[PDB]
Design a protein around this motif. Sequence first.
Motif, PDB file in Angstrom:
ATOM      1  N   UNK A 286       0.811  -1.211   0.000  1.00 23.37           N
ATOM      2  CA  UNK A 286       0.000   0.000   0.000  1.00 23.37           C
ATOM      3  C   UNK A 286       0.848   1.266   0.000  1.00 23.37           C
ATOM      4  N   UNK A 287       2.110   1.184   0.417  1.00 23.88           N
ATOM      5  CA  UNK A 287       2.990   2.347   0.332  1.00 23.88           C
ATOM      6  C   UNK A 287       3.428   2.565  -1.111  1.00 23.88           C
TER       7      UNK A 287
ATOM      8  N   UNK B 228       8.134  -3.902   2.973  1.00 24.62           N
ATOM      9  CA  UNK B 228       8.394  -2.505   2.662  1.00 24.62           C
ATOM     10  C   UNK B 228       9.291  -1.895   3.731  1.00 24.62           C
ATOM     11  N   UNK B 229      10.395  -1.301   3.296  1.00 27.47           N
ATOM     12  CA  UNK B 229      11.409  -0.790   4.207  1.00 27.47           C
ATOM     13  C   UNK B 229      11.387   0.731   4.226  1.00 27.47           C
ATOM     14  N   UNK B 230      11.051   1.349   5.362  1.00 27.20           N
ATOM     15  CA  UNK B 230      11.219   2.805   5.481  1.00 27.20           C
ATOM     16  C   UNK B 230      12.669   3.230   5.396  1.00 27.20           C
ATOM     17  N   UNK B 231      13.597   2.334   5.734  1.00 28.59           N
ATOM     18  CA  UNK B 231      15.001   2.703   5.841  1.00 28.59           C
ATOM     19  C   UNK B 231      15.677   2.824   4.483  1.00 28.59           C
ATOM     20  N   UNK B 232      15.175   2.124   3.470  1.00 25.98           N
ATOM     21  CA  UNK B 232      15.573   2.372   2.091  1.00 25.98           C
ATOM     22  C   UNK B 232      14.472   3.087   1.321  1.00 25.98           C
ATOM     23  N   UNK B 233      13.393   3.479   2.005  1.00 27.52           N
ATOM     24  CA  UNK B 233      12.265   4.186   1.399  1.00 27.52           C
ATOM     25  C   UNK B 233      11.768   3.442   0.166  1.00 27.52           C
TER      26      UNK B 233
END
Length: 281
Positions: free
Chosen positions: A127-128, A139-144
Amino acid sequence: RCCQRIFSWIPVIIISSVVLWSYYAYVFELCFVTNNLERVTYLLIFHVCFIMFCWTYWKAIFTPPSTPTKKFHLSYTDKERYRPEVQKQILVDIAKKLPIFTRAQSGAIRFCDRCQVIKPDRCHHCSVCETCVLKMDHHSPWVNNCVGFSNYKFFLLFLSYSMIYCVFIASTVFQYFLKFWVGDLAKFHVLFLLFVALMFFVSLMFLFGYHCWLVAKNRSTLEAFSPPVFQNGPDRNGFNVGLSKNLRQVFGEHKKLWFIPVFTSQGDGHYFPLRTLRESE
Ligand SMILES: CCCCCCCC/C=C\CCCCCCCC(=O)O[C@@H](COC(=O)CCCCCCCCCCCCCCC)COP(=O)([O-])OCC[N+](C)(C)C
Ligand SMILES: CCCCCCCCCCCCCCCC(=O)O
Ligand SMILES: [Zn+2]
Ligand SMILES: [Zn+2]
């Protein structure tokens, strides 16, 4: 919105800032403080570590997810999107010709309303990224960015080089403060640097290790937390075809390209070798 898109980049900004500050710290101050030949040798080793970190980090961030092919898409109009059981039967008849052996817990064909996609095995909707992603790990926020079929190898290489960099920085600062303690010379603030390095290192140790596990057994994070459902029920090892081929599915057959972030993973993103067929010709 603009605000949201800006905020999605802040983890990347944080890691990049910490890395650049560690570069500035080691290169000048610490490398000078701790023979010319020795200093140049260690500066070039450090630079190779740095370049591999940036290489793998970049390709982890900017490699887009792989997406199901046209064959897995429903080409319906807005009008045709309407009665649910007829849709179920339609999807079954289509799946008769598609290499999809996983189902929902109800037994239904896995289907994405947003992408109009008959999800391949191991494909999940993000969904991101707002798209179906093939062998989506997470889904990784750290690699966006999503981590999945297209960039998983780059992600693991990024973890590895992150660890090596952390060990380099930590060991360097420790040697600096020991030499200070033995009076062979301080910059007390760089002590904080050590505490950062250590932290990241230990964190990576839990993360790297975990992914080692996953990669050894051909299991995605999503699958690790929710086993895929096959014709005979859930199976935590449905895609486990042995350590060697599990590893080579991600890193490829060619050893020279194992530790560099060029795409080398095996298979299409859709059918994945069944453990149950691993000794069938
Ligand atoms: C390229 C990398 C590949 C290299 C080869 C890899 C070799 C093989 C590597 C690893 C195989 C070792 C398996 C250990 C299992 C122990 C028993 C156990 O704990 O059972 C438990 C699972 O176990 C876990 O959850 C493990 C979690 C991993 C934590 C980090 C350690 C990784 C090892 C670092 C290794 C570094 C080696 C050095 C690498 C250079 C219980 O099982 P369960 O009840 O079914 O759990 C359900 C959980 N659920 C609720 C979420 C569903
Ligand atoms: C001060 C020494 C260096 C500190 C910085 C080193 C780099 C650490 C980066 C770690 C990022 C881990 C990202 C995990 C992403 C995920 O699991 O989704
Ligand atoms: Zn989708
Ligand atoms: Zn995503």
